[PDB]
Design a protein around this ligand. Structure first.
Ligand code: A1CFC
Length: 330
């Protein structure tokens, strides 16, 4: 089997991407944030504290003839940005782009943090990291991809995120029309539960490529590119007036600037992030200070190849017995 679904930016800055997912019988379609950095499929629901729902579409398990309470199971997750959610668990039929999994754990939120309440466009998350990170207790549950994998034509999914435009998540096949050149594959460590790999270096604009190993994670659920402070300083030093602002929480730059590109290495291959992808717009409405799309990972404990990086590439998440990651230009 295969599936193919369009993923759409939630706003004009590409702050996140939402993908329609069918849950239950008859289908209830919710727009979920596909997140290769976590491993829980959770949704706003009829159980979510009413004051914490503000415009999201909710899953109502009592209206699904295939929903079953997973008795005794609870979940609770805290994300790296400080967001969180928790609740109980149903199993139900879940379909993405024509690919169906029966008995998928659907984690129903009883509580969500304010960041989720305030984003009316995100009805939940669909985790695509390794199932060892799933938070369901006392019986850990599998991700949608892990449940689907044996049925797929090939044990892979691909992320093709757009810049200020829709893109595609495919399951079970590699669309050879969606990229240019060849796909370069690189090793993955699953020891932390992430799609963790080592970039071979970077360049700023038209500058020379610096060969240096940068361990990090491919994370579709994180907006920006978080890299070591040395790398980030070298980037922003090429932008007149750019500075790190403690009060704003990162590097800012004059909105009048034209940003240089940023290149990262995948083996001997190179992925080029155009400068415009690194502009996240005014820090507050009407400001002439703009927020940078490349930020330091120093306070995080891990480097994160988030959407800013991944949207410059066609990315293969290869879930074979030994997982690997592939990157192609597009
Ligand atoms: C809009 S939001 O509050 C959000 C979405 C995804 C993650 C996982 N990286 C964390 C927070």
């Amino acid at each position: 089997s295969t599936g193919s679904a369009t993923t759409t930016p939630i706003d004009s800055l590409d702050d996140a991407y939402i993908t329609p997912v069918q849950i239950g019988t008859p289908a209830q379609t919710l727009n979920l944030d596909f997140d290769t950095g976590s491993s829980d499929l959770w949704v706003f629901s009829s159980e979510t504290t009413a004051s914490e729902v503000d415009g999201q579409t909710i899953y109502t398990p009592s209206k699904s003839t295939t929903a079953k309470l997973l008795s005794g199971a609870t979940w609770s997750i805290s994300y790296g940005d400080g967001s969180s959610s928790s609740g109980d668990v149903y199993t139900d039929t879940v379909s993405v782009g024509g690919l169906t999994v029966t008995g998928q754990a659907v984690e129903s939120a009883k509580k969500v943090s304010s960041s989720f309440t305030e984003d009316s466009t995100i009805d939940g998350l669909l985790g695509l990291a390794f199932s060892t990170l799933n938070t369901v207790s006392p019986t850990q549950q599998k991700t949608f991809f892990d449940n689907a994998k044996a049925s797929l034509d090939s044990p892979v999914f691909t992320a093709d995120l757009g810049y200020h435009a829709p893109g595609t998540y495919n399951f079970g096949f590699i669309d050879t029309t969606a990229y240019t050149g060849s796909i370069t594959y690189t090793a993955v460590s699953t020891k932390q539960g992430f799609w963790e790999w080592t970039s071979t270096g970077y360049a700023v604009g038209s500058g020379t490529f610096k060969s240096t190993s940068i361990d990090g994670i491919a994370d579709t659920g994180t907006t920006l590119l978080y890299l070591p402070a040395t790398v980030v300083s070298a980037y922003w030093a090429q932008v007149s007036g750019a500075k790190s602002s403690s009060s704003v929480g990162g590097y800012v730059f004059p909105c009048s600037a034209t940003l240089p590109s940023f290149t990262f290495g995948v083996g001997s291959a190179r992925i080029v992030i155009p400068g415009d992808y690194i502009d996240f717009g005014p820090i507050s409405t009407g400001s002439s200070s703009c927020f940078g799309g490349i930020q330091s990972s120093a306070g995080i404990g891990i480097n994160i190849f988030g959407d800013v990086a991944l949207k410059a590439a066609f990315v293969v998440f290869n879930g074979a017995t030994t997982p690997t990651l592939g990157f192609a230009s597009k």
